[PDB]
Paper text:
Cryo-EM analysis of the cleaved S glycoprotein showed an intact trimer in both the neutral-pH (pH 7.2) and the low-pH (pH 5.6) buffer. Our cryo-EM analysis of the SARS-CoV S glycoprotein and ACE2 complex sample captured three ACE2-bound and two ACE2-free conformational states of the trypsin-cleaved and low-pH-treated SARS-CoV S glycoprotein. The structure of the other ACE2-free state was determined at a resolution of 3.6 Å with C3 symmetry imposed. This ACE2-free state had all three CTD1s in the “down” position and was designated as the unbound-down conformation that is not accessible for receptor binding. Structural comparisons of the CTD1s from different ACE2-free conformational states showed that the “up” angles of the CTD1s were between 50° and 70°, while the angle for the CTD1s in the “down” position was approximately 22.7°. The “down” CTD1s are located immediately above the S2 subunits and have direct contact with helix linker 2 (left). The direct contact should stabilize the prefusion S2 subunit and prevent it from transitioning into the postfusion state.
The spike (S) glycoprotein of the coronavirus is a class I viral fusion protein located on the outer envelope of the virion that plays a critical role in viral infection by recognizing host cell receptors and mediating fusion of the viral and cellular membranes. The coronavirus S glycoprotein is synthesized as a precursor protein consisting of ~1,300 amino acids that is then cleaved into an amino (N)-terminal S1 subunit (~700 amino acids) and a carboxyl (C)-terminal S2 subunit (~600 amino acids).
Numbering used by the authors:
A (entry chain B): 290 to 660, 674 to 722
B (entry chain B): 964 to 1119
C (entry chain A): 723 to 811, 832 to 1059
D (entry chain C): 723 to 770
E (entry chain A): 50 to 239, 244 to 289
Write the structure that this text describes.
Amino acid sequence: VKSFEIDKGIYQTSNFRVVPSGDVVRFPNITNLCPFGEVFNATKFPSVYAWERKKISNCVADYSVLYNSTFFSTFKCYGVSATKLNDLCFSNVYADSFVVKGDDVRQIAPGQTGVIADYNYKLPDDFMGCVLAWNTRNIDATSTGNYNYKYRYLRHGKLRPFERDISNVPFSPDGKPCTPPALNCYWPLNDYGFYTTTGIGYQPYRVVVLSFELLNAPATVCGPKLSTDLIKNQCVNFNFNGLTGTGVLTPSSKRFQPFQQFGRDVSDFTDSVRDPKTSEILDISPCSFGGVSVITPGTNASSEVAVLYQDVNCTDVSTAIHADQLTPAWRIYSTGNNVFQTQAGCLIGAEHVDTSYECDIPIGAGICASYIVAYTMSLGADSSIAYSNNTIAIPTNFSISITTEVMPVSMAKTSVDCNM
Amino acid sequence: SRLDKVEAEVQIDRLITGRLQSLQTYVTQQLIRAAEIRASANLAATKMSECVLGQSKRVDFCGKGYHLMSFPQAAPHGVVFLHVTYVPSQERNFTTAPAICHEGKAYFPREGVFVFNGTSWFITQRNFFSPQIITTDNTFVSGNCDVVIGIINNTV
Amino acid sequence: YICGDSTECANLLLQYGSFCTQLNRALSGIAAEQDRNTREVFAQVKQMYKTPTLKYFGGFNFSQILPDPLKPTKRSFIEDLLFNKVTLAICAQKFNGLTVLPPLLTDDMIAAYTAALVSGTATAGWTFGAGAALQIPFAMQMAYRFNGIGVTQNVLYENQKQIANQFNKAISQIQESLTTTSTALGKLQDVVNQNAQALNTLVKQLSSNFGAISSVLNDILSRLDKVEAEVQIDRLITGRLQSLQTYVTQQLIRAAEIRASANLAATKMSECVLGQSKRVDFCGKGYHLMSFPQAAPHGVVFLHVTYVPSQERNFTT
Amino acid sequence: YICGDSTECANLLLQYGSFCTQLNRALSGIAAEQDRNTREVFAQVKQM
Amino acid sequence: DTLYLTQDLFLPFYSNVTGFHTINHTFGNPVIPFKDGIYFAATEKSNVVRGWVFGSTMNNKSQSVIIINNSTNVVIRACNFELCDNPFFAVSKPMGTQTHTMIFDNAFNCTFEYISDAFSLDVSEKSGNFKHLREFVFKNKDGFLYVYKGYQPIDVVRDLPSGFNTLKPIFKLPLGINITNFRAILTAFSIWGTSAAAYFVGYLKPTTFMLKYDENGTITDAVDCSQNPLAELKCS
């Protein structure tokens, strides 16, 4: 409150939260080594109109051969970033490979179809991983002519995302299976022109598209982590197959369907999960939070305070302080007494009083402090009147009681120069 | 000092947007405080036109008692009243009759309750104890002597 | 609410100044003003009386209005109907960041205040307010309330049994017209539904993107690396901060409207209940013979005993 | 008012959540409260 | 126990049904256009309606997929397929042995083959109530192929009964082929033959739905938005 003198009352202050103690990482027990030494390093690579889609699953990916190497020409990721790629577990990663010139890599992005990357290989706009391309001018490029690998440049319309056509159709603007090379009947095929001492844009590149099918199953492909044990009923951290966070885990009462992995609530929050090694536990990720609020007597009569933890049950608070877990971690602070009723939370530094007083300081729900004590409340002077018939009290003497009453009429007349 | 060109305009747009949101927040919250303070100002004008300029019989509005007088005083950014009230604090225990049956027909007092049947003596006011002698001026003809609860005779 | 929790998003939040302190001060001020509202309306009794446990005075019986010790609850039955009517839309533990603090004045203590008010209305005289009581036997009270109405005293003592039966049948028709009926408790349901719609709208604004890649923290925090991430987190913080600031401003306006209604309620309980307010069509609809407060979920419900004369002759003058 | 009309600006508007629904609810509530104001002031006569 | 508005390709309520009531006089197996995901159902007796040929021009130069059964297991192969005017299942009447599964005529430039988990399956001719009832959704999205499944035992004379039936996500495929026209495959009893059974077709449409989950985690009611003004009021 930026003062030395502090007046009497509950004042709001900072927010407490239990720092997590354990660390729980849970991956499935599937351990295997990926074919990345084969799909990224192969001898035969197809053309663009017959791009190959390899299912890579039930593995543990390294995600380090892609980084500690300058062999790769263009390593541009779209949906993810580089360094934290081995922190996730995917499901059925698919590798899409094809061979183009040095010019078509500029047309490989979400959007920007252009010339060649529209009729031949269409990308989506959301579901993307990383697009990898490296130069192979010393294998495929022959200076006398490599007329082996082809593409298409005449098709009636565009493609949907991840759609492929191999069918060598005798292209014509009105259907019309033709007999080419008749007029207005051309072929859709065309060669590449991979030469040795040609320009950089005419050199062969091998483009590999790593589609990341994000978690449509219990996950198979993972990174090199270490699956640890579970710690229930204690605030820990997370790293599940596709989920991190911070939580208090507990066994559930669910009716969880077998095809399923996540358990979100009525209003879109996680609230329950499925362990990758046959368990279905809830996720109360609010370990504890709230806000402390210091009850003070007023710094002119006393200087002993009492903290009101607001949304707790005085078991996480005592365990959190005696094991030093809270974020407003003090230095001179202990817990001898702990008043807890009236669910507005823990009240460290107070005493129950049966003799209810006139509610100096309003703690939460009913309970009121003073002086420090924490009683409930004296709602007023208790009374009971003799209510028989005809006897009637008339006042006989009186007084005059000039009582003040304060009304504000006009606050501070301000103005703002909104150019300075 | 350490900026040159349009990269600077990103920084200045961030600062202008933030300070403009803060100033707009200030203007909105001052406007809400002005609504609350003009509600209190209308209460103050109402109290100064009821309490000060007359005697406002509505209960627990001007003061706490029965509001005998009222005196306005100035204040920094406000007004402070001084409600001269009337608090009666003593109590006796006298008996009553809700009627008087003198000659064979009931007498209700003055609408203006508590006939004083303290052994059938007087008729007083509602608030301050003030006995008056029972005559026909202090009562009126009312029906017959069939609907009473208490009984008083010899209204002379 | 803003910035779910990691480490660095908190630094990006601290680089917007002290908006979190502003919003906490504003919402704590709103909570204190609502505590003041409940103290202004109900706590007008210094001298809390006891229920007289007789509850039958000339036929004016206060069954289902004054509480009963034979039942376990310290309410009354009309209060039980009003508590059952208003639906809603250990300690709770949810990671919205949001909460609902418990009110200060407890619901049983609210029912104690209302039972004290009704008992001091029925017993305890008419000078209630400026003083303590007078020990007036409640037929003399409504004989006095027949004098701020422009009728004589001949009405009540000559129609004792008739007015008693009309009063009891009026209370019983209230007991009928509260149970199986409909929207005529609508203001309290509008308060609860508007608060629930505002809070569910805030939770719904958590669900949405504000122009980033994905609409949730800790799942973008897998596939991000560095300062390009700070663009996304600044978009999410700016959007959630505008939504939370919109919520705080609209709750502050609702608090202004609800404290205007609270000042109306305190005015009606100090005019109608604690006396007889002769101003026309303010307390009830008739000429306002009595008034009885009752508790309610997040409100108050009066029972204005009025006086409606309905027959007509044609006399000359 | 926002986003005059094309096709894609509407997608950019839907990527800000349900603010349009909030503003329509608030303005319809204001309209209903002003109807209630005119009913409260004038319509105090049952028997015209 | 929630209500979840989602925009996704579903079947609209109350809409039109292209019913194919095949009998011993009516041989129902035409070519049908695909048109962005279909619905399917079939009131059957011992699983006649295995077979779906999702093609482009329904010939040798059309990359197509085939989802059939070899009476033991689901076999899914996608390649260039010489599609004939009537590929048929020679199911015998006393036994039920497909001696002449003649579907894979030739194969070149093949790109896919999948064989799922084997399970119990009946083939031969039965009669009585319409106990067997598939309900499938053959959905296209992001180049994939989606195939769902759900069951309901009914006893109807010849129509499609009214009632909700939730479906569950069995298959997903990485294929990516230009599915414009398709067919189904039936069984020719043994002169061909079927029993009094039929199969249905509905088309999908991208509109918003309000799914009412129960406390156990199962849809008990769904409400379309674009059907009725009361229906958009319900999902609003």
